[PDB]
Every structure is written in C-alpha cells, then in structure tokens.
Amino acid sequence: DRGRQVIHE
Amino acid sequence: ILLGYAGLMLLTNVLKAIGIWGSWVIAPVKLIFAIIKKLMRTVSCLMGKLM
C-alpha cells in the first residue's frame, strides 16, 4: 500500500 | 468544574498531538487510484481510436 501511494501521489 | 477542565485539557492534548493525519492519507490513496484508473481507460480509448 505504501508503494502504491508513493507511485500514485 | 474539574471534569470540564480535564476534558478541555484532553481535547487540547489531542489537538496538539500529530495523530489526525489519517483521513488526509487514506482518502487521497483511493482518489489518485481512481484517477490513474480513469487515465488508463482514456489511454486505452486513445489507442483504440488510433487503431
């Protein structure tokens, strides 16, 4: 989830 | 009066503590996830139009 957020934001 | 002052102190301690940044982290995740999904859908539509 943290990696997904880093890729998204 | 003591209970009211204790409640006010607890409220001030909660407001001063940095622990409220939960919604501003959870909601933008799914927001930008839906944004990226819409972007991928638009890219697929553009590729189909080009084909």
Residue type, A9: E
Q: Which residues contact B28 (CB under 8 A, 6 or more apart)?
A: A5, A8, A9
Cα separation, B32 vs B29, whole angstroms: 6
Which of B11, B51, B25 shows the shortest CA–CA distance to A1? B25
Single-letter amino acid, residue B13: N
Secondary structure in 3-state letters for B4-35: HHHHHHHHHHHHHCCCCCCHHHHHHHHHHHHH
Give the single-character DSSP code of B44.
H
The answer to whether A4 and B32 have CB atoms below 8 angstroms apart is no
Contacts of B29 (CB under 8 A, 6+ apart): A1, A4, A5, A8
């553009």: which residue's tokens?
B46
Contacts of A1 in chain B (CB under 8 A): 29
- Judging contacts by C-beta atoms under 8 Å, the chain A residues touching residue B28 are 5, 8-9
